[PDB]
Scaffold this active site. Structure first.
Site, PDB file in Angstrom:
ATOM      1  N   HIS A 277     -15.823  -1.653  10.001  1.00 53.93           N
ATOM      2  CA  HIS A 277     -14.622  -2.239   9.224  1.00 53.93           C
ATOM      3  C   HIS A 277     -13.772  -3.373  10.016  1.00 53.93           C
ATOM      4  CE1 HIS A 277     -10.542  -0.835   7.105  1.00 53.93           C
ATOM      5  NE2 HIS A 277     -11.073  -1.996   6.418  1.00 53.93           N
TER       6      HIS A 277
ATOM      7  N   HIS B  37     -11.580   1.255   3.135  1.00 51.80           N
ATOM      8  CA  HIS B  37     -11.481  -0.336   2.937  1.00 51.80           C
ATOM      9  C   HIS B  37     -11.578  -0.861   1.638  1.00 51.80           C
ATOM     10  CE1 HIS B  37     -12.922  -4.707   3.471  1.00 51.80           C
ATOM     11  NE2 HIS B  37     -13.727  -4.433   2.803  1.00 51.80           N
ATOM     12  N   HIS B  38     -10.342  -1.824   1.353  1.00 54.48           N
ATOM     13  CA  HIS B  38     -10.465  -2.523   0.202  1.00 54.48           C
ATOM     14  C   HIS B  38     -11.307  -3.825  -0.109  1.00 54.48           C
ATOM     15  CE1 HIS B  38      -6.833   0.189  -0.062  1.00 54.48           C
ATOM     16  NE2 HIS B  38      -6.856  -0.018  -1.435  1.00 54.48           N
TER      17      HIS B  38
ATOM     18  N   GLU C 247     -13.028   5.183   7.570  1.00 53.39           N
ATOM     19  CA  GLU C 247     -11.623   4.581   7.466  1.00 53.39           C
ATOM     20  C   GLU C 247     -11.989   3.970   5.708  1.00 53.39           C
ATOM     21  OE1 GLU C 247     -11.192   1.172  10.276  1.00 53.39           O
ATOM     22  OE2 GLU C 247     -10.833   2.621  11.799  1.00 53.39           O
TER      23      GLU C 247
ATOM     24  N   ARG D 125       0.610  -1.096   0.050  1.00 53.92           N
ATOM     25  CA  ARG D 125      -0.148   0.127   0.052  1.00 53.92           C
ATOM     26  C   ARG D 125       1.001   1.207   0.071  1.00 53.92           C
ATOM     27  NH1 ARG D 125      -4.323  -0.121   3.033  1.00 53.92           N
ATOM     28  NH2 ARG D 125      -4.049  -2.334   3.082  1.00 53.92           N
TER      29      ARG D 125
ATOM     30  N   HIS E 135     -13.498  -7.313   8.657  1.00 53.26           N
ATOM     31  CA  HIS E 135     -12.335  -8.082   8.677  1.00 53.26           C
ATOM     32  C   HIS E 135     -12.530  -9.286   9.325  1.00 53.26           C
ATOM     33  CE1 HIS E 135     -10.323  -4.793   6.318  1.00 53.26           C
ATOM     34  NE2 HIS E 135      -9.687  -5.974   5.759  1.00 53.26           N
TER      35      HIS E 135
ATOM     36  N   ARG F 193     -10.158   4.414  17.385  1.00 53.59           N
ATOM     37  CA  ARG F 193     -10.460   4.503  15.986  1.00 53.59           C
ATOM     38  C   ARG F 193     -11.744   5.128  16.035  1.00 53.59           C
ATOM     39  NH1 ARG F 193      -8.907  -1.706  13.730  1.00 53.59           N
ATOM     40  NH2 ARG F 193     -10.068  -1.060  11.830  1.00 53.59           N
TER      41      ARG F 193
HETATM   42 ZN   LIG Z   1     -10.497  -3.304   5.055  1.00 52.60          ZN
END
Ligand SMILES: [Zn+2]
EC number: 3.1.-.-
Lengths: 132, 83
Positions: A126, A101-102, A99, A4, A130, A95
């Site tokens: 998020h 996210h991919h 965010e 990244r 995950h 957090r």
């Molecule tokens: Zn993500």
């Protein structure tokens, strides 16, 4: 050290969004990158995904259809290229901001800078994505 | 000082809130730290929503936020500002 952090150019179309754009961030796979933002960022080169993230929020700050749904304090934040704060009930510990996210993970060959592979999420959503 | 609301004059607290509202920091990390500090000082159940997600018609200017905090703490048995 990390994929990244390698330079690349942004690509992809995004999708039409409305006033509820950021409300979608806490649901499903997250909210799409707005088509209007993708128009501004396509073909720009970025040194890292963090630089791309800054650019998204700067464009949000300048877009009257997207910025009008942020209060004055969140407007100030995105004007600096920071991610805006989510509602308290969507934060997790330290957090507290939206965010990126991919959808197809980078570690599984997902594209870093393809906006069609990127989603806006809350920290709560998020973390849950995950964890499946 | 920094440890509790009772260590702040009202004017000093308004300074903190103004810095937050204007995102007057050198990093996102710094702003997150200040917001966390605000939530810890105020003890208000709404947390950062006081700054970013006001109830309809609430005054979300820096002076409005200070007033909301001041009134809530006064009405809910909490210690007030210094002086
Ligand atoms: Zn993500």
């Amino acid at each position: 050290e990390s994929k990244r952090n390698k330079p690349g150019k942004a690509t992809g179309k995004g999708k039409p969004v409305g006033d509820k754009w950021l409300d979608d961030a806490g649901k499903d796979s997250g909210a799409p990158i707005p088509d209007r933002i993708a128009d501004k960022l396509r073909d720009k080169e970025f040194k890292s995904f963090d630089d791309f993230r800054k650019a998204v929020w700067e464009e949000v700050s300048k877009d009257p259809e997207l910025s009008k749904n942020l209060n004055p304090s969140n407007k100030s934040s995105v004007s600096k290229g920071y991610s805006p704060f989510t509602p308290k009930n969507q934060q997790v510990g330290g957090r507290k901001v939206y965010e990126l996210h991919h959808d197809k993970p980078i570690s599984q060959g997902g594209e870093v800078y393809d906006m069609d592979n990127i989603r806006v999420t809350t920290p709560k959503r998020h973390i849950d994505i995950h964890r499946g | 000082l920094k440890h509790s609301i009772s260590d702040y004059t009202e004017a000093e607290f308004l300074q903190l809130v103004t810095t937050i509202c204007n995102a007057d920091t050198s990093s996102e990390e710094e702003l997150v730290k200040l917001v966390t500090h605000f939530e810890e000082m105020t003890e208000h159940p709404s947390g950062s929503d006081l700054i970013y997600f006001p109830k309809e018609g609430d005054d979300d200017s820096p002076s409005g936020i200070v007033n909301t905090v001041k009134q809530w703490r006064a009405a809910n048995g909490k210690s007030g500002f210094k002086q």
